[PDB]
Amino acid sequence: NHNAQALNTLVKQLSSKFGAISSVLNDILSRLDPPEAEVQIDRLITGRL
Amino acid sequence: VNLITRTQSYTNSFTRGVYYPDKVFRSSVLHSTHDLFLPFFSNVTWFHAIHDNPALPFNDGVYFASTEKSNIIRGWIFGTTLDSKTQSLLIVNNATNVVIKVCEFQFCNDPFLDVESELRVYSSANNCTFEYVSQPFLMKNLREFVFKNIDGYFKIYSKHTPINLERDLPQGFSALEPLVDLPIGINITRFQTLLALHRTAGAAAYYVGYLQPRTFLLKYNENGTITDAVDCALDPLSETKCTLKSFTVEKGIYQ
Amino acid sequence: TSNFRVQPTESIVRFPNITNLCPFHEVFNATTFASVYAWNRKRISNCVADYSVIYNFAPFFAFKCYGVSPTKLNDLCFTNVYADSFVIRGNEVSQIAPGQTGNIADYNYKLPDDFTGCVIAWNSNKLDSKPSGNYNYRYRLLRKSKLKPFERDISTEIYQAGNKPCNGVAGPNCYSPLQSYGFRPTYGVGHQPYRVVVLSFELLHAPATVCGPKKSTNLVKNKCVNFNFNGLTGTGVLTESNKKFLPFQQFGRDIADTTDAVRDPQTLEILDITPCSFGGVSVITPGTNTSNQV
Amino acid sequence: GQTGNIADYNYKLPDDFTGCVIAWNSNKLDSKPSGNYNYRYRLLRKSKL
Ligand SMILES: *[C@@H]1O[C@H](CO)[C@@H](O)[C@H](O)[C@H]1NC(C)=O
Ligand SMILES: *[C@@H]1O[C@H](CO)[C@@H](O)[C@H](O)[C@H]1NC(C)=O
Ligand SMILES: *[C@@H]1O[C@H](CO)[C@@H](O)[C@H](O)[C@H]1NC(C)=O
Ligand SMILES: *[C@@H]1O[C@H](CO)[C@@H](O)[C@H](O)[C@H]1NC(C)=O
Ligand SMILES: *[C@@H]1O[C@H](CO)[C@@H](O)[C@H](O)[C@H]1NC(C)=O
């Protein structure tokens, strides 16, 4: 149960926005220009790491 | 001299007024959602309208319940100031279809309809920002409706529950399926229900509750429909269920 | 050593079929843009959003998009489009920008921090400037409090600043809240009339029904294909799904909060999405001294 | 990171640009009463630069 709960928590945290406007990455790829989207992708990467 | 009279009583909401928070399919799962819901076992105002309180505040949202077999209830009027100054939403329901119109249809503190035909009501409309037509909302039977406005969208949820042979509101779950979301973007402060009288003797009975910001735990069966729900702040047992994300709580002490 | 992925063979895009095109030719070329204090708010939905007609007009003075990349307008699908049309002076057009404050920003039209949309401003001096002067264009420079985003203030609130109201006559601290724009053609850049349309692209988890000229591709099954369903893009294999959606929801999710099923806009069947094969690659080797076989 | 007609259709700089912009007035030395029409700018292009 502990192993399953840890994996489920990881996959759930994959959907947290961590202050960014959106949680989907391919969405923000086709959404925004690079220089302004880099900060939000940095927030996502920091949260996921 | 008092043409309009409305007798108000109090009743128990039981476990009623839960709807689908979003149009996303889920199966065999428990989902916790924070939104405007009708609190479980809350006080619901039962209004008997017989031909002076016409001001029903809208608050966050409204839960309407109709239970008459006679199909005597027809439409709604939603308005902030309910005068010609501000635009208002109006609903028309007849056997053929339903017509939603954001129009300043001027009615006094006693709105109604003529009945047969109702062509005598309005010759024309002054302004109409938004219009819509559809198959009629209404089809004993319990018509449960939920109205709200969030981020500029006005959303309606509905459920036409075929009640078994029994008197009052059952202790069962009727998850209200959404019907129409209109991007109207108008302020709303008060609402009024339009009783149907023909041309006179006539009466109506309805239930009104007010939604509140609450966190709920919803159960989806293997088919996708909601079977049960838990209101977290109702009692400590429900809070324990919400914390554990399980409808069955084992023996122990839970923070 | 490495990780193995099955690269997508094809790309399928499924957008709902609407013959009607959006009235983009009406929000522009309207020969009348009302005024800034009462700016026209038009709703755009359930139509083809062809952004080429926007570029088909005169070279724009300022085509600045904040939350959306301008080149990606056709690819992206939006729920609702709010066209906010008005006319302002040129120097105030630059006031609609992050970090920049101005009278128009706070007392005429305010944008939210997470505003996803486009500001399109172009001159109409050769078409909307007259020697007499268009006195219809007026702005309200006085308000009790600041304007929250997406708010319009047109009610004549009782502005009793002093003890005695001016009562319609001139006096100290008695000025008209509505200031008519001075449209003199001899004036240079910074005072000429400019038509500004703010296309607010409000999108959320709802049937968008507003996409763009994208020829839909035939549906494929049992092949890792880049699917674009109503703006939801992903990589996976599509299979005919046994699960029965209720008539009103279009996406499916599992206990992991991931998109697992999708309802096709054109034909109403439920498709299960399975991620195409991914894995790790291990190199089983003896010592490099013994042999190089792996 | 500054967008505009001149930025995309006349002269584009990178976001990570490391350098210095030195701009001064030269009206008294590069302007004539007839008007120097050699100085021109491109405001229309099929795509950006
Ligand atoms: C129902 O009301 C609509 C209102 O638009 C009307 O067009 C229609 O004829 C009505 N049906 C009747 C009277 O049977
Ligand atoms: C309709 O809209 C106009 C313009 O806003 C307004 O002057 C009028 O009072 C509204 N209602 C009527 C009665 O036409
Ligand atoms: C949902 O569908 C299944 C068959 O796929 C059926 O067995 C089940 O009873 C349905 N749900 C309900 C609550 O009836
Ligand atoms: C602008 O619109 C008018 C009609 O309102 C039309 O007669 C005219 O040709 C249009 N011209 C353009 C594209 O500016
Ligand atoms: C257009 O969409 C409708 C709605 O599903 C569909 O029945 C019809 O086949 C479509 N027509 C096409 C794809 O040519």
UniProtKB/Swiss-Prot annotation, chain D:
It comes from the Viruses. Residues 36-44 are annotated as: Immunodominant HLA epitope recognized by the CD8+. Changing Y41F: In strain: B.1.1.298. Attaches the virion to the cell membrane by interacting with host receptor, initiating the infection. The major receptor is host ACE2. When S2/S2' has been cleaved, binding to the receptor triggers direct fusion at the cell membrane. When S2/S2' has not been cleaved, binding to the receptor results in internalization of the virus by endocytosis using host TFRC and GRM2 and leading to fusion of the virion membrane with the host endosomal membrane. Alternatively, may use NRP1/NRP2 and integrin as entry receptors. Binds to host ACE2. RBD also interacts with the N-linked glycan on 'Asn-90' of ACE2. Cleavage of S generates a polybasic C-terminal sequence on S1 that binds to host Neuropilin-1 (NRP1) and Neuropilin-2 (NRP2) receptors. Interacts with host integrin alpha-5/beta-1 (ITGA5:ITGB1) and with ACE2 in complex with integrin alpha-5/beta-1 (ITGA5:ITGB1). May interact via cytoplasmic c-terminus with M protein. May interact (via N-terminus) with host bilirubin and biliverdin, thereby preventing antibody binding to the SARS-CoV-2 spike NTD via an allosteric mechanism. This is Spike protein S1. It comes from Severe acute respiratory syndrome coronavirus 2 (2019-nCoV). The chain holds residues 413 to 461 of 1273 of the full protein.
